[PDB]
Amino acid sequence: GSEIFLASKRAAITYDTDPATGEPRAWLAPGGTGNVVAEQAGVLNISWIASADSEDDRRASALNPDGVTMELHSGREILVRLIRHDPAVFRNVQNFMTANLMWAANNYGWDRWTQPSFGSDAREGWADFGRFTRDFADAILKSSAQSADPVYLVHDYQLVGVPALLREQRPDAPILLFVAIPWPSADYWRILPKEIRTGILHGMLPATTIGFFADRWCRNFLESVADLLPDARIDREAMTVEWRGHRTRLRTMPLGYSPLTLPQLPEGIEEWADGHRLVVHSGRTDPIKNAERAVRAFVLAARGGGLEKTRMLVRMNPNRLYVPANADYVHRVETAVAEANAELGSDTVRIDNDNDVNHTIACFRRADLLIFNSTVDGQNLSTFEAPLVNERDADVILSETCGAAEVLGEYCRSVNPFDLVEQAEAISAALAAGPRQRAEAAARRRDAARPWTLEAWVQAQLDGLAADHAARTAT
């Protein structure tokens, strides 16, 4: 049985008080990555190291600096250890990670002609990132200090610098890093200042395994390594890097949905949609989700005719609205919806901007057409969840630039997310399709989506790491 040490930016703990006794309670949320790892075969025990990012987390960390054992179903347990970072460092690294810098870097947000223009802010951001990375590595190693053969799983882009620091003190350990966002083309990656574009690669390559959601991101990562590290040797076929002794395997490990996580509609929506076919676009208040272009394409489709009793819901989950790109995105979507309604008629298009998974799942079930047209997406789990819960045989329009398109693209209407005409034509054809044609397409779609579960993805990581560890050990 393995001794697992999982590191991620957050370990979702629910903090409340008992309804009977009033005593404070802290319990791990179902479906955490730690919860799923804890259930696998060759796992003896598991520790989870994450950042404290609330007063509740901070009190929890201060009470048990070495971590608390928290219970799971089937009498299983997991040692959860929360790191209290320097608040100034932590806040800056959080700003470093948003579209103010690193989110634009990995998610294709810069035009190059006018943005970005790196100043001293980027240099201080990168220094704070180094301090933050050292926080995690020290706490991870301290938590694993007594384990003979610890297995390290590192998750979330915030932790890409961690594998190098673990490797420095644990030369022989299995280390998996999983990157859940895209990796950009080499030319775009090197937009970043020299110390960042190389320093991030120096931090990741000491992992035994680097996983992405999609082949394209593995390829882009390899091309970035070849472009920027003259000392590295990549093998595009074998998906390997050899660099300064480090032998690294890149793997594609798709994730679709969690069965557990995946009710009522939001207030006003059921009656607003009644008697209408309902186009649903859903995603975070993030520029990549592309709802502005979806609304413009819908308007272009409505001009073609055949959409007289069709409405469109833009369902948004508010997130990092303090970032100017996220707020600008919302403003741009609002402007397009306003122009859509002025041209096609009042209440043709509605934005529903609120945080509630249940409401969104209900929007998935109700949808007569689902639009997941991201400009880019590491994977996009909604495009798996939505067909699985939809019972209206809704077609799915899926951007070719989502990682999910590598798994689902043949079973959806695949589109260039920048081409309004193509997207308008896909909306029209999707809504003109007949009942039995959509039934059969949706049947094959759900069959293509169903196998890609959270537990399969965890199993893929462990199996892939064990094989890569064996390879690294013999070589």
Ligand X SMILES: Nc1nc2c(ncn2[C@@H]2O[C@H](COP(=O)(O)OP(=O)(O)O)[C@@H](O)[C@H]2O)c(=O)[nH]1
The residues of the shown chain that bind ligand X, judged by CB under 6 A, are 261, 284, 317, 355-357, 360, 379-382, 385
Q: Which entry of its own copies, ligand X, none binds 123, CB below 5 to 8 A by partner kind? A: its own copies
Comparing CB distances to ligand X, the nearer of 248 and 373 is 373
State the binding partner of 183 from ligand X, its own copies, none, CB within 5 to 8 A by kind. none
Closest distance between its own copies and the C-beta of residue 155, in Å? 24
Min dist. Cβ of residue 262 to ligand X (A): 7
Choose the one of its own copies, ligand X, none that binds residue 130, judging by a C-beta under 5 to 8 angstroms depending on kind: none
Please, what is the minimum distance in Å from the beta carbon of residue 110 to its own copies?
A: 6
Residue 224's binding partner among its own copies, ligand X, none (Cβ under 5 to 8 angstroms by kind) is none
- Compute the half-sphere exposure of residue 418: CA atoms within 13 Å on the CB side of its CA: 4
Contacts of 422 (CB under 8 A, 6+ apart): 415, 416
How far apart are CB 108 and its own copies at their closest, in Å? 5
Of 36, 49, 46, 288, the closest CA to residue 150 belongs to 46
CB of 122 or CB of 398, closer to ligand X: 398
By the rule CB under 8 A, 193 interacts with its own copies? yes
What residues contact residue 384 under an 8 Å CB cut-off, 6+ apart? Answer: 256, 257, 404, 408, 449, 452
User: Among residues 247, 332, 446, 472, which is the contact residue for its own copies, using CB under 8 A?
Assistant: 332
Using CB under 8 A as the binding rule, the residues of this chain from 107 to 136 that contact its own copies are: 108-120, 122-123
Ranges within 418-437 binding its own copies (CB under 8 A): 418-422
In whole angstroms, the minimum distance from the beta carbon of 237 to ligand X comes to 29
381 binds, among ligand X, its own copies, none (CB under 5 to 8 A by kind): ligand X
DSSP 3-state assignment of 349?
strand
CB 394 within 8 A of CB 370: yes
The residue within the footprint of its own copies, chosen from 31, 416, 467, 471 (CB under 8 A), is 416
Please, what is the angle between helix 357-366 and helix 382-389, to 10°?
A: 60
Q: Is 329 in the site for its own copies (CB under 8 A)?
A: yes
Question: For residue 116, is the peptide bond before it cis, meaning its omega torsion is within 30 degrees of 0?
Answer: yes
Q: Which of 186, 104, 107 is nearest to 399 (CA)?
A: 107
Contact of residue 401 among its own copies, ligand X, none (CB under 5-8 Å per partner type): its own copies
Tell me if residue 240 falls in helix, strand or coil: strand
Query: 174 with 469: CB under 8 angstroms?
Result: yes
Torsion of CA 167, 168, 172, 177, to 10 degrees: 0
> Which range, of 39-47, 85-93, 180-188, 438-446, touches its own copies by CB under 8 A?
180-188
Phi, psi of 356 (to 5 degrees): -170, 100
Closer to its own copies by Cβ: residue 126 or 452: 126
Residue 120: name its binding partner from ligand X, its own copies, none (Cβ under 5 to 8 Å by kind): its own copies
For 325-361, letters b (16+ CB in 10 Å) and e give bbeebbeebeebbeebbeebeeebbbbbeeeeeebbb
Nearer to ligand X, 377 or 393 (CB): 377
Select from its own copies, ligand X, none the partner in contact with residue 193, using the beta carbon and a kind-dependent cut-off of 5 to 8 Å.
its own copies
Tokens of 73: 């179903």
Whether 257 contacts 381, CB under 8 Å: yes
Question: What is the C-alpha separation between 10 and 224, in angstroms, rounded?
Answer: 28
Measure the CA–CA gap between 309 and 316, rounded to whole angstroms. 23
Neighbours of 70 (CB within 10 A): 18
In eight-state DSSP terms, residue 402 is B
For residue 104, give the nearest of 433, 328, 394 by alpha carbon. 328
Place of tokens 């219970």: 71
Q: Are 420 and 433 contacting, i.e. CB atoms less than 8 angstroms apart?
A: no
Q: Tokens at residue 40, please? A: 């696998």
Site for its own copies in 225-264 (CB under 8 A): none
Q: Pick what 208 binds: ligand X, its own copies, none; C-beta below 5 to 8 Å, kind-dependent.
A: none
The reply on whether position 284 binds its own copies by CB under 8 A is no
**Minimum CB–partner distance for residue 33 and its own copies (Å):** 28
Looking at the Cβ atoms of 5 and 257, the one nearer to ligand X is 257
Pairing of strands 24-28, 43-51: unpaired
The two beta strands, 175-178 and 150-155, are parallel
Which residue lies nearer to ligand X by CB, 115 or 358? 358
| 293 binds its own copies per the rule CB under 8 A | yes
Q: Which structure tokens are listed for 279? A: 């186009």
Residues 45-104 close enough to bind its own copies by CB under 8 A? none
CB of 119 to its own copies, least distance (A): 5
Among residues 9, 131, 190, 276, which is the contact residue for its own copies, using CB under 8 A? Answer: 190
Residues that bind its own copies (CB under 8 A): 108-120, 122-123, 184-188, 190-194, 216, 220, 223, 287-288, 292-293, 296, 300, 325, 329, 332, 375-376, 400-401, 416, 418-422
